[PDB]
């Protein structure tokens, strides 16, 4: 669902470049 | 062993802070922490902060047991004071002094 | 007319590195050079996530004044001073002591 | 109360504006003095 993509996506992602 | 914690350029006058500083001089930091908690002043929360910081310093850096600590030296000095301007009636103006102060707390197991 | 250049092997006259020898990486405009294995400083680097740069203490090489380094004569094993002559029609460098070209 | 400066643009520029100075001998002397003191702006222009 949406919140899964929102959370997980920039969670893993945002965790890596930031 | 003596430990320092300071807060420099705090807004409050030296004078106002002194009132509170002189409440806690000499006590063991537990009893003193409480003195500060239930004092109603601004200076009180400033100095509370600095004292707590001081405890953290002692324990973490110098390995002091919290129970033993007393407040051995606590003094408030004058800080750099900033000029402002308040306009007054009939045109004259007033250089205002917004005062600051240096709160310096030092604790020791002895 | 520039005496010390890229890739020259030099010896260090002055500083904590006095006596050490090495290879020139590059030169800077201010008359400073940066030499291999020479003048290491320990620099603190705040970790940067964009460049994937970890933190930590990086040993880096800090510029040294070019007056302080001498061009190393490999023949004589001594520091030397340099001069210029015209061979062919070209401007060339030589060592003052044995007056041999580079 | 009613103070001394009641601003107007058209007024400002007809009175002190560049062209107004340049109109006359005296004005061009002003602009001479200013250029000699090396001001950031000579006249009042926008």
């Amino acid at each position: 669902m949406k919140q899964s993509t929102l959370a997980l996506l920039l969670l893993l992602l945002l965790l890596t470049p930031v | 062993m003596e430990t320092i914690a300071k807060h420099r350029h705090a807004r409050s006058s030296a004078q106002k802070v002194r009132l509170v500083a002189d409440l806690i001089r000499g006590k063991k930091v537990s009893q003193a922490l409480d003195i500060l908690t239930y004092t109603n002043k601004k200076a009180a929360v400033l100095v509370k902060k600095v004292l707590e910081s001081a405890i953290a310093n002692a324990e973490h850096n110098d390995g002091a047991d919290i129970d033993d600590l007393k407040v051995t030296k606590i003094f408030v000095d004058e800080g750099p004071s900033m000029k402002r301007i308040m306009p007054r009636a009939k045109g004259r103006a007033d250089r205002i002094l917004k005062r600051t102060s240096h709160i310096t707390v030092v604790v020791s197991d002895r | 007319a520039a005496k010390i250049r890229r890739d020259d092997e030099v010896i260090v006259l002055t500083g904590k590195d006095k006596g050490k020898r090495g290879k020139v990486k590059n030169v800077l405009s201010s008359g400073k050079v940066i030499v291999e294995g020479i003048n290491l400083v320990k620099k603190h680097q705040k970790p940067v996530p964009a460049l994937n740069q970890p933190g930590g203490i990086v040993e880096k090489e800090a510029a040294i004044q070019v007056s302080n380094v001498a061009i190393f004569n490999a023949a004589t094993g001594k520091a030397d001073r340099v001069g210029f002559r015209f061979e062919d029609g070209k401007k060339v460098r030589f060592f003052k002591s044995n007056s041999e070209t580079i | 109360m009613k103070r001394t400066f009641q601003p107007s643009v058209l007024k400002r520029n007809r009175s002190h504006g560049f062209r107004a100075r340049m109109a006359t001998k005296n004005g061009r002397q002003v602009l001479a003095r200013r250029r000699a003191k090396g001001r950031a702006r000579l006249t009042v222009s926008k």
Partner: protein, 56 residues
């Protein structure tokens, strides 16, 4: 009216001799929770004289 001579730090000290605050002596210890608090005032957890009279 305004003073005639600059009053010395001495006088200035005297006037302030009364300005000292009074540290509150007692910290009452509530029975149930055990936290310290003021006489007649509720605790940080809303305890008073053994009740929890505030849920908060």
């Amino acid at each position: 009216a305004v003073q005639q001579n600059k009053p010395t730090r001495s006088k200035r000290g005297m006037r302030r001799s009364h300005d000292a605050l009074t540290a509150v002596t007692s910290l009452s210890v509530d029975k149930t929770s055990g936290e310290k608090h003021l006489r007649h005032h509720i605790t940080a957890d809303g305890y008073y004289r053994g009740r929890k009279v505030i849920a908060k």
